[PDB]
Amino acid sequence: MLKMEAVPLRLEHRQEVIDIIVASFYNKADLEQWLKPGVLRTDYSDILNDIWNVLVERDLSFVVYDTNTDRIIGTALNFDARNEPEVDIKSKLLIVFEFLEFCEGPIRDNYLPKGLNQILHSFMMGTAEKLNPRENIACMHFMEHEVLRVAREKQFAGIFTTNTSPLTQQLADVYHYKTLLNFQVNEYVHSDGSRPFGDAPDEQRAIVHWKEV
Ligand SMILES: NCCC(=O)NCCc1ccc(O)c(O)c1
Numbered sequence: 001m002l003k004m005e006a007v008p009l010r011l012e013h014r015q016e017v018i019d020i021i022v023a024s025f026y027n028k029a030d031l032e033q034w035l036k037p038g039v040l041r042t043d044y045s046d047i048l049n050d051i052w053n054v055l056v057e058r059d060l061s062f063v064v065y066d067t068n069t070d071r072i073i074g075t076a077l078n079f080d081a082r083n084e085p086e087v088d089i090k091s092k093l094l095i096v097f098e099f100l101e102f103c104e105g106p107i108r109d110n111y112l113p114k115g116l117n118q119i120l121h122s123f124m125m126g127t128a129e130k131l132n133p134r135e136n137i138a139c140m141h142f143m144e145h146e147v148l149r150v151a152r153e154k155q156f157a158g159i160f161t162t163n164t165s166p167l168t169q170q171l172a173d174v175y176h177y178k179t180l181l182n183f184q185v186n187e188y189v190h191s192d193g194s195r196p197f198g199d200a201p202d203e204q205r206a207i208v209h210w211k212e213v
C-alpha cells in the first residue's frame with residue numbers, strides 16, 4: 001500500500017516539481033493538445049521558474065513523498081487567488097491561461113469572497129510519471145485531502161480550481177466541490193476570433209470548482 005507524506009514546498013524542490021509538472025502536462029493536458037504544434041516542455045518550466053521563489057515564499061504549496069522510497073510522487077501548487085504573481089507568458093500557454101481566466105475571472109471577482117486569504121487557488125497539480133493507476137488515484141486522493149487541510153489551517157474560506165481533465169473533474173465532484181462553471185472548451189473564442197480548442201469534442205469541458213472549507 002502506498003504510504004505518503006505531504007511536505008511544504010522548499011526552494012530545493014524546484015527541479016523535482018518541474019519534472020512532475022512537465023511529465024503531468026506535456027503531451028497530456030487536454031487543452032494544450034489542441035494548440036499543437038509549438039507547445040514545448042520548457043513552456044511549463046519557464047512558468048514555474050519565473051514564480052518559483054514567490055511560490056515557496058507564500059507557503060501554500062507542498063510536495064508528496066512516497067515515505068517508502070523517500071521520493072516525490074506528486075505536488076499541489078496553490079496561491080491565494082487574489083495574491084498571485086504576474087507572469088508574462090510567451091508560449092501558446094498564454095491562450096490556456098487567458099482561457100482559464102475567462103472561466104475563473106467573472107466568477108471569482110463577482111461571486112467569491114473579497115479580500116486576501118479567502119480563496120485558495122489550487123492552480124496546478126501533478127503526479128510522477130511512473131505511478132500506476134492505483135498509485136496515481138491514491139496520490140490524487142491524498143493531495144485533495146491535504147489541500148483542504150492547508151486551506152483550513154491557513155484560514156482560507158474555500159478552495160478554487162478549474163479542472164480540465166475528466167479525472168480531476170470527476171474527483172472534484174466526489175469531493176463535493178460545487179460546479180460554478182461547466183464551459184465547453186471548443187466554444188472559447190481567442191482575441192483573434194479563432195477557437196483555439198475548436199477541434200475538441202463537445203464533451204471536453206473546463207469546469208470551475210469551488211468548495212467552502
Ligand atoms: N485542480 C487541478 C487543476 C490543475 O492542476 N490544472 C488545471 C489548470 C491548468 C493550468 C495550466 C495548463 O497548461 C492546463 O492545461 C491546466
Ligand SMILES: [Ca+2]
Pocket residue numbers: 005007065067070
Ligand atoms: Ca520525507
